[PDB]
Amino acid sequence: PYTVVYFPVRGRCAALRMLLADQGQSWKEEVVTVETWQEGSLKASCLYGQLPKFQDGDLTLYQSNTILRHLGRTLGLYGKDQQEAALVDMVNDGVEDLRCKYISLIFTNYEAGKDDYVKALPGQLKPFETLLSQNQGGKTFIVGDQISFADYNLLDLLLIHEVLAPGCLDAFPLLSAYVGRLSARPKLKAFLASPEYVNLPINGNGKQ
Amino acid sequence: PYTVVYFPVRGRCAALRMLLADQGQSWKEEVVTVETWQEGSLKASCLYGQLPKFQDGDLTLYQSNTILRHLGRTLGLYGKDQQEAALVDMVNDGVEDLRCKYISLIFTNYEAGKDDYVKALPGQLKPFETLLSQNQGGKTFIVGDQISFADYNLLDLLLIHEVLAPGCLDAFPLLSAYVGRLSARPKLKAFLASPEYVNLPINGNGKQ
Numbered sequence A, B: 001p002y003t004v005v006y007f008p009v010r011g012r013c014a015a016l017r018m019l020l021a022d023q024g025q026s027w028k029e030e031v032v033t034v035e036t037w038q039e040g041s042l043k044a045s046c047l048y049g050q051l052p053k054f055q056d057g058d059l060t061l062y063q064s065n066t067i068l069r070h071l072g073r074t075l076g077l078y079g080k081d082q083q084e085a086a087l088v089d090m091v092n093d094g095v096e097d098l099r100c101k102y103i104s105l106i107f108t109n110y111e112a113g114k115d116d117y118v119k120a121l122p123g124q125l126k127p128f129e130t131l132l133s134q135n136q137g138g139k140t141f142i143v144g145d146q147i148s149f150a151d152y153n154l155l156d157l158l159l160i161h162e163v164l165a166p167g168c169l170d171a172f173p174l175l176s177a178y179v180g181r182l183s184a185r186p187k188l189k190a191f192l193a194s195p196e197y198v199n200l201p202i203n204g205n206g207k208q
């Protein structure tokens, strides 16, 4: 089946976990503690010396987006045709770029860079509002009318930003409706409210 | 047909151009000058306010890797099955990570960070040597036995690093043989030697 090996944080696994849950998939969690990591053996065995590590049968993967695209490909959450598949990538890549800046703020300079980051947020979120406005008035999903791996990843990005800069979505009616709508999906709602998600820290450094 | 809109540099378009050339595809180049860019109109029309921008018929794409995956998907350079498609992603993601550090060195702190970067290079390149050693002794491609978009992207990464730290591939027999082998492909060889590639600067800041 599925197995995700990662630290005891949401981080780069939050989105794929949401995906697995909403799709009614069963998976195993292998928690890696800082002590175990600092031992060195696991780090060395990891291709790019990092986690998350994922296992699907005897297929061992690395790189969060690779896991997302894999599930998306295998579970049919990658658009209805090639054109949509490309637009799904365009969204995910955009999500990835903003996630990098978020991760850099959280770990590199939270105290001094928080104010500038928040001021720049509207411009960074705007593109997703625009994408949504061009797809059935943003009443369905980010691309096409069926959900895709990019939705789960975007949803996480928006959620974590709500905690960082509460109210950042008030200026974006479509994104706000989008978050609420998807968060309400039965399997997803139950997952987001469970101890498995709630009691895990967003990032590992105690900052959010 | 195909149209790539980008600045007069190789940068994030080098790989997709190599892909187009080697596959015998025709494309149009729309060169964007700093003056045109600083005018503002084009920047605003771009989804994430950035280039490269790509057009395939009336399909308008953004994000370099999205263009690579698109060509890969449409041209059959994405593995022979789902498993390979996932390994192709794992490689490309790895290439992307290292490209980001390269881009950060080139634009953020070349003078002070060049020495530390080069020292760390072997560890960063090693994973690709390892991947190659596990695939038919690294005698064919990075994943499977047919070429994929990840090859073109990896090939570029290696080439640009040869200029940054000449000889960095001497410690990696498989990667070196790989670069030479692919650079020798007829259409690709002719492209790499043409004025269209040679007279374009790698990055835009005059550093390499």
Ligand SMILES: CCCCCCSC[C@H](NC(=O)CC[C@H]([NH3+])C(=O)O)C(=O)NCC(=O)O
Binding pocket: A007, A009, A011, A012, A034, A043, A049, A050, A051, A052, A062, A063, A064, A065, A203, A204, A205, B097
């Ligand atoms: C301690 C709690 C905080 C954990 C933060 C998240 S783990 C961060 C880091 N992993 C990554 O950055 C993964 C990046 C990779 N590109 C992906 O998308 O999967 C890692 O393994 N780092 C370990 C290392 O590189 O030594």
Ligand SMILES: CCCCCCSC[C@H](NC(=O)CC[C@H]([NH3+])C(=O)O)C(=O)NCC(=O)O
Binding pocket: A093, A097, B007, B009, B011, B012, B034, B043, B049, B050, B051, B052, B062, B063, B064, B065, B203, B204, B205
């Ligand atoms: C002047 C010559 C130097 C050009 C350097 C390359 S262009 C850099 C930048 N674009 C990107 O970083 C693209 C990143 C995007 N994630 C991708 O992969 O396509 C840009 O458009 N920047 C313009 C802007 O953001 O204003």
